[PDB]
């Protein structure tokens, strides 16, 4: 049917090769129309493993991680370490809801093993160092959204939101 | 198009149902698609048709029925061949009206009216400007209904639309259908005001109240004045102007000093008097619309361009739009303050104006901000959503509904944070140092607060009591006696007023100044105050003690000939030579009865030393001592603001609650029974056998596009005739109709469209006029309107009947005429008219039996909360198709200093499903009225009220019907002085229980106990 | 560290015409704030530690020279911690279990979030199970006439508690949390008594987070007012902003000040902190540091019990 | 608190209403319902109860009718109006005492059979006369209302 | 500290009492008593302090300055007050008893509930700290009683059962220990549980319908009929008079407080409703 994938947005270079399909159908959940990014999904209760940044399953509700949603199943060499599920479009913490969904959606999430050997003394990290914000514009918003550099003349507007909208926690271990 | 949009509003002759399928064949005979000819004929002297693409999709994307009766049948009159002109209800589907032999006729009767415009429209000097459009947008209805012509429905197939509403929705959508070709940024603008009741309640003396409710409406009116000529009329979408005592006033003034002729206004002022105003005290003789009838919940539709004089800029300015509305609102407040300053200078020497002349210079930095904040959103549409590269795009029916959902969700997202307008002011510099301007007593402890606003630091302080005369001279206010008179007269000693409440008292002493912002870039900021100086139009305004004394007023009036003898040693039988014009119709129907109704009953027979006088005067002249209690009724509609979105909550209040629209699939079994029944009744003629085929095809055994792939039932038989349709593709009859109905019964609401909104708008306006005439038929006094609600004072005796007559009128079912709104059983019926009523949406009243000397702020805020919380906490048993369920809204709450009683009004959850339902609306109030008659006229002893305490627990504890019947019957018979009376509870009221949880108010649980509580409240209010 | 203030009887914190959610039986000339503004707790502590070394001062420099950083204030039943929650002229008291998952409610679907809001303020709101709003009428009597002394009739709405309730505030420098323990004081209002009882209950004191909860009114300098009241959606998500008077100084018997604030219990966004810090950077900033010193600008993490000031 | 007694009384009255066949017995029962409640609280419970049983004529057949009336619903206690109504009111009092556990039900249904224990029943009631004056007032007044309402005056 | 000394005391209603409040909730009463928060009668500290001040300003007219200082001034609020009463908490109401199965027959007993005892605890706890005369025995009685919360307990032995106020039957679980008499009334003291103690107390309040008669024709005047609610005789309230050391609070307790014992509280003094006796609980236990 119709499926999509979640993809973390870290500050570490675990971002290059995680996607396989760019359009899937004709549309993606994460829309960017003349105002900045929309439909940014947050995963609460789980932290990251930035070195190969993957979702560490915690129970702390203080821990949240953010990422964008696009269509596709990742790289066709996976699904024995990832989160494949199906929720009727009402049980997803999506920020900047612009449109509607058909009350059904198949999602993929990059998941990690807890690494049950250490105490998860986590810590959140913010998006700064526009140099990183610059060279991350290409790797995530070009191979995925071709409309950029054609309809988004306001790159400087969609730059600040990266540094103010997206954030997450990390183990730091 | 701009200044050519009349063909939009006029595309059809309102005798459109009479020329379809030859119902009148002689209309196209003696003349120099079939109906569009006379349409093209009647669009004369100005322009032909704009059918290339100006009106095409606008008519397509306003009717919301092209998707209902098929896109080709919607444009093939000769299908289902309906000679029968049935008028249908918009909200209902079964309420009908028959239309016969009352229609304009060709070339000898069609001219009896078309030139009567040109008796009053043409003669004025004008380069075909939009004032014609501003003098056609309203008086078209008037020249029609004055020509005793019956409003015809829109489509002989689906007649849930009056031709007038059809063409007005056309004109409305025309803005969008035009603008989204050049810049493609048409808009749906929504203006809203924050904390209306919170603001109104900030006053005293009932003058502050009236003018506060008038401010909240004018300051919003002034916003559209800068918008009803800037890009002309027809734009203000939901608050309609079809019956609007503010559009009228503005017009009749706009035909002065703009296009002023004399015989013209003679022709129309009397004409506009009948069908929009009805009040002998017109706009004139007050020079102000007497009723604040702007709700605040207003929305507008926008092209996306701006004209700077003979030249409009097709420029985006995407969001540099709503800030213009905000600066216009601020500029209206600035204009009102400037006018107050000018009027203080013109009144340079007069006490009450020697103060405003003083304060309006003591502080001006503070008053630069409005005393009421508005809340504005703006949703956007682009040509990519109307057309697919040239032509009408799919889902174009869905957008307007989706856009309105977007706007309402923007609003409900802004309700989550309330910003009191006082927060806008800057006070840290003043309140930290010795910087506050205090007149009178400068409080040595920094400052004090207003005794009306309550929160802001007052600027004026009048002493409480030393001798109440000298201290005004001592502390730099009076300095003489000619002015301390007005001082003590307009603001009582011991008062503390902030700047804003001081302005309120000023305006309540000079209402005409509202014109300053009531016209709107139509006069000069000094022209109006000059007209005010050149007159002495005194205005009297009822107080609380005033309205607490209607009956004794009328008994002095009926005893006028034997009372003035015992009178005249206290100057009450005097006559005031001046012509005071109150906005209180009951005063206008009196005060020429040799009685100075312009007095303060608080002073004479509500005082502490003089009442002992008057009671003696009363004890020998057979008049009851006055009642120190008035009533304060306040209505409000259930889910009206959510009826505008199509949700079923107004049809089933309590059954289908609000929150049930997240996972409405849980409540599926009823939403079907509502919508599919509506539809199969929606649309008379032969289409009934058509919508019935597919109604359940959605999931019975047919999947998507699957009833359309199997059912050839009738469409193939409505075709194959002479020349009718030349496109053989018959799947289009159902290929998309199935999707239409699937959306409808999958999303659980009616597909919202501009026609829906303008129809409900005109309905709200008519309901206003009705309720206004109803309050005035009683001896009450209106304080507000707005469709959603109504606030008004009225004596304690005329409450119940009023309420009983209010709801029944609000549901379009009455017994007497309303000036000219000859009410029907579901329609309003102005002289040979039939406009649909609001028969399914409920209504809820709040009543406060308040002693006159009570703190108006508190009584108004309590009347507000006792309706808001009460609206969402009360529940009661309602018979859902026989079996009982629990309802939420549609009650009437009474309050007599704590003593409370909630009275339901429907007890039948789909409010109306039969012409006989109207009889049982608010019937419990008729029960109470009958019982009051039997108790007062002495057929049932008073002790029946108190003797209920013993039958309370028995009747409450009996779950059997006839047993409670016998119980209540002998409770009635025991205290039944005649002993063979037939006063009998309606036999359904046994068992109706009311649960009120999660709040500490004490409410009886059973209906029969609430009835006696209501009776006790009403009686004890009259003593 | 943490201070408990149990009211020994109904008690009133005067409020100017601010609370109208409650269906009042009769009127009353003065309502009572549900949670005492931090000016009141500040002054209540300052009353105990008052000497003649005071001298001149805008009632706060002299006040700040007596105490540590008071943090906030919230309710405390037996075990439970109730917290203020407001959505615009509509107050509520709820426990932590329902704060933890608000952001989703504040950003979810239309009708889902309407459901959530409704059941928050009506169903799970434990206010009316704690606070009863009893009204008291008072009069005076001239010993001569032995009747009511004319013009002397005041009506006040008190705050009556149905069960043992404390007020929880956190402070520092237990060098004063000794001279304060077990001391009954005239906690703000017309001569009402509450008992102080300090314990040792360590809590977090700094956290970064998307959404915060204002346990105490956040003060607006009014130089930001103009450029703040236009974009509330950037800063506040749910609550109420309006002018409040700080209080009434006992030093020189005057109303203290007035400035727009975000009332106790209000969901603000993390865009608040940068705004306030990067709006006032001068004598204003020192003034507002004096303010926050007595528990004014306070947030609380919606996830776990952790506080933070704004300008520090 | 005695706010369930407005339902208990309803049940007992429904029973004794469907139990009396001759309408004259119903009107006589109404008379008793009005008369006895004053005496119970003026003259004491024990004197009024002695009066009631003395006018009730506790014979084993009418006693069996009452026993079934406790459990059945069609039970027909018959005889004479002025004598079956007193038994009906005694049934009212006993229905109360059973359903409020003031006296144990099995003990009652047993002592209404064995003549010897029928006297120990009266003894028990003597040991519960103060308790059965406070509890039963509301119940008996409800029966009074129901009697005046549902049984048409003679 | 600014609260150096406390002073708990009982308020024994010699006659009936009426400390009014405008018609507010009117469970068919037009002039109700002063409710607490739960529904129990209480005396606001405002009324209590005002009446006590008014009384002392006559029976000690020379010391008008000391009364002024300790209890606030009339027109000179240059200085606050140095004494302060807490809201008088209802402590024990009388109630008519028909005691089944008991030795020493009684016609009336006192009645309290665990709610009232908790409210009294709150006071005694919050006071013992500064109170150099720690009422450890009294507070120990009150927190021993509170151990049995949830049972209709009696502070005596020989009740075992009773019918209170001729409508409510209670099985009085006794005290498994011996407790000295809280007051010097040989009458027992029942501590009922709540929701049954609300009835026995709610029914022990004298509600009275009153009328006004036309002086000339021995007939009622129209509208001259209302109801009132009094607190019965022998009722006992509890309160504390706080204080901050002032060197005239010393004399205010040395001369004034230990001297006075009878005071007129509440309204309707002409109907003789309000003579009340003040017993300081520091000389008794
Ligand atoms: Zn004011």
CSV table of C-alpha atoms in Angstrom, one decimal, chain B residues 198 202 373 405 408-409 411-420 422-429 431-434 443-449 453-457 464-465 642 647 657-663 854-855 857-858 861-862 864-866 869-870 872-873 875 888 895 897-898 997-1001, chain C residues 16-18 20-31 58 86-90 106-107 110-115 117-118 121-125 128 132 151 221-226 229-230 232 236-243 245 248 252-260 266-267 269 284 287-288 291:
chain,number,residue,atom,x,y,z
B,198,UNK,CA,-15.4,40.4,29.8
B,202,UNK,CA,-16.8,46.4,32.9
B,373,UNK,CA,-8.2,43.6,21.3
B,405,UNK,CA,-11.8,24.2,8.6
B,408,UNK,CA,-11.7,27.7,12.5
B,409,UNK,CA,-8.7,25.6,13.6
B,411,UNK,CA,-9.1,30.4,15.7
B,412,UNK,CA,-9.5,27.6,18.2
B,413,UNK,CA,-5.7,27.5,18.3
B,414,UNK,CA,-5.7,31.2,19.4
B,415,UNK,CA,-8.4,30.7,22.0
B,416,UNK,CA,-5.8,28.8,24.1
B,417,UNK,CA,-4.1,32.0,25.1
B,418,UNK,CA,-6.3,34.9,26.3
B,419,UNK,CA,-4.7,38.4,26.1
B,420,UNK,CA,-6.7,40.9,28.1
B,422,UNK,CA,-5.3,46.0,29.5
B,423,UNK,CA,-2.0,44.1,29.1
B,424,UNK,CA,-1.3,46.2,26.0
B,425,UNK,CA,-0.9,49.4,28.1
B,426,UNK,CA,2.4,50.5,29.6
B,427,UNK,CA,2.3,51.3,33.3
B,428,UNK,CA,5.7,50.4,34.8
B,429,UNK,CA,6.9,54.0,34.5
B,431,UNK,CA,3.0,53.2,38.8
B,432,UNK,CA,6.6,53.1,40.1
B,433,UNK,CA,7.0,56.9,40.5
B,434,UNK,CA,4.7,59.9,41.2
B,443,UNK,CA,-4.4,58.7,47.0
B,444,UNK,CA,-1.3,59.0,49.2
B,445,UNK,CA,-0.7,55.2,48.7
B,446,UNK,CA,0.2,55.3,45.0
B,447,UNK,CA,-3.2,55.0,43.4
B,448,UNK,CA,-6.5,53.1,43.4
B,449,UNK,CA,-8.4,51.0,40.9
B,453,UNK,CA,-13.0,48.3,35.2
B,454,UNK,CA,-11.8,47.0,38.5
B,455,UNK,CA,-8.2,46.4,37.4
B,456,UNK,CA,-6.8,49.7,36.0
B,457,UNK,CA,-5.6,52.6,38.1
B,464,UNK,CA,-17.6,59.7,49.5
B,465,UNK,CA,-19.3,62.0,52.1
B,642,UNK,CA,-19.9,24.6,14.5
B,647,UNK,CA,-21.0,19.0,12.0
B,657,UNK,CA,-21.0,15.8,21.0
B,658,UNK,CA,-18.1,17.9,19.7
B,659,UNK,CA,-15.2,15.6,20.6
B,660,UNK,CA,-16.9,12.8,18.7
B,661,UNK,CA,-15.5,14.3,15.4
B,662,UNK,CA,-12.0,12.9,16.0
B,663,UNK,CA,-12.9,9.2,15.8
B,854,UNK,CA,-26.7,44.9,42.3
B,855,UNK,CA,-23.2,45.3,40.9
B,857,UNK,CA,-20.5,43.7,36.5
B,858,UNK,CA,-21.2,40.7,38.7
B,861,UNK,CA,-20.6,37.9,34.4
B,862,UNK,CA,-22.9,35.5,36.3
B,864,UNK,CA,-22.5,34.7,31.2
B,865,UNK,CA,-21.0,31.9,33.3
B,866,UNK,CA,-24.3,30.4,34.3
B,869,UNK,CA,-20.7,26.3,32.2
B,870,UNK,CA,-24.4,25.4,32.4
B,872,UNK,CA,-21.6,22.2,29.0
B,873,UNK,CA,-22.4,20.6,32.4
B,875,UNK,CA,-27.5,16.7,30.8
B,888,UNK,CA,-26.5,18.3,26.6
B,895,UNK,CA,-31.2,32.3,38.9
B,897,UNK,CA,-29.9,34.8,44.2
B,898,UNK,CA,-28.6,31.2,44.3
B,997,UNK,CA,-21.7,16.5,37.8
B,998,UNK,CA,-18.3,18.0,38.5
B,999,UNK,CA,-19.6,21.3,39.9
B,1000,UNK,CA,-21.0,22.4,43.3
B,1001,UNK,CA,-24.2,24.1,42.2
C,16,UNK,CA,-8.8,42.6,41.0
C,17,UNK,CA,-11.8,41.2,39.1
C,18,UNK,CA,-9.7,38.5,37.4
C,20,UNK,CA,-14.8,34.5,36.3
C,21,UNK,CA,-15.0,30.8,35.5
C,22,UNK,CA,-16.9,30.1,38.7
C,23,UNK,CA,-20.7,30.3,38.8
C,24,UNK,CA,-20.9,32.5,41.9
C,25,UNK,CA,-24.1,32.3,44.0
C,26,UNK,CA,-23.7,35.9,45.2
C,27,UNK,CA,-21.3,38.7,44.4
C,28,UNK,CA,-18.3,39.6,46.5
C,29,UNK,CA,-16.1,42.8,46.4
C,30,UNK,CA,-12.8,40.8,46.2
C,31,UNK,CA,-11.9,37.4,44.9
C,58,UNK,CA,12.1,50.1,46.1
C,86,UNK,CA,-4.7,27.8,32.7
C,87,UNK,CA,-6.2,28.2,29.2
C,88,UNK,CA,-7.5,31.7,29.3
C,89,UNK,CA,-9.9,32.8,32.1
C,90,UNK,CA,-10.1,29.1,32.9
C,106,UNK,CA,-1.1,21.3,22.1
C,107,UNK,CA,-0.2,20.3,18.6
C,110,UNK,CA,-8.5,19.6,16.0
C,111,UNK,CA,-11.0,17.4,17.7
C,112,UNK,CA,-8.5,15.2,19.5
C,113,UNK,CA,-7.0,18.2,21.2
C,114,UNK,CA,-10.5,19.6,21.9
C,115,UNK,CA,-11.3,16.4,23.7
C,117,UNK,CA,-8.5,20.2,26.7
C,118,UNK,CA,-12.1,19.5,27.7
C,121,UNK,CA,-10.1,21.3,32.7
C,122,UNK,CA,-13.3,19.5,33.5
C,123,UNK,CA,-12.7,15.8,34.2
C,124,UNK,CA,-9.1,15.5,35.6
C,125,UNK,CA,-9.0,19.0,37.1
C,128,UNK,CA,-12.9,21.7,43.1
C,132,UNK,CA,-13.9,25.6,48.2
C,151,UNK,CA,-21.3,52.6,54.5
C,221,UNK,CA,9.5,44.7,30.8
C,222,UNK,CA,7.0,46.7,28.7
C,223,UNK,CA,9.7,47.7,26.3
C,224,UNK,CA,9.0,44.3,24.8
C,225,UNK,CA,5.2,44.6,25.1
C,226,UNK,CA,4.7,46.4,21.8
C,229,UNK,CA,1.9,41.0,22.0
C,230,UNK,CA,1.9,40.6,18.2
C,232,UNK,CA,2.3,35.3,21.2
C,236,UNK,CA,3.1,31.1,24.8
C,237,UNK,CA,1.1,28.0,23.8
C,238,UNK,CA,-1.6,28.1,26.5
C,239,UNK,CA,-2.4,30.3,29.4
C,240,UNK,CA,-3.2,34.0,30.1
C,241,UNK,CA,-1.3,37.3,29.9
C,242,UNK,CA,-2.5,40.5,31.5
C,243,UNK,CA,-1.5,43.4,33.7
C,245,UNK,CA,0.1,44.7,40.2
C,248,UNK,CA,1.6,46.4,48.2
C,252,UNK,CA,6.0,53.1,52.5
C,253,UNK,CA,2.5,51.8,52.1
C,254,UNK,CA,2.0,52.0,48.3
C,255,UNK,CA,0.9,49.8,45.5
C,256,UNK,CA,4.1,48.3,44.1
C,257,UNK,CA,4.1,48.3,40.3
C,258,UNK,CA,2.2,47.0,37.3
C,259,UNK,CA,3.3,45.1,34.2
C,260,UNK,CA,1.9,42.5,31.8
C,266,UNK,CA,0.9,28.6,31.5
C,267,UNK,CA,2.6,26.6,28.7
C,269,UNK,CA,7.8,27.7,24.6
C,284,UNK,CA,16.2,46.7,33.0
C,287,UNK,CA,15.8,45.3,37.8
C,288,UNK,CA,14.4,42.0,36.5
C,291,UNK,CA,12.5,40.6,40.5
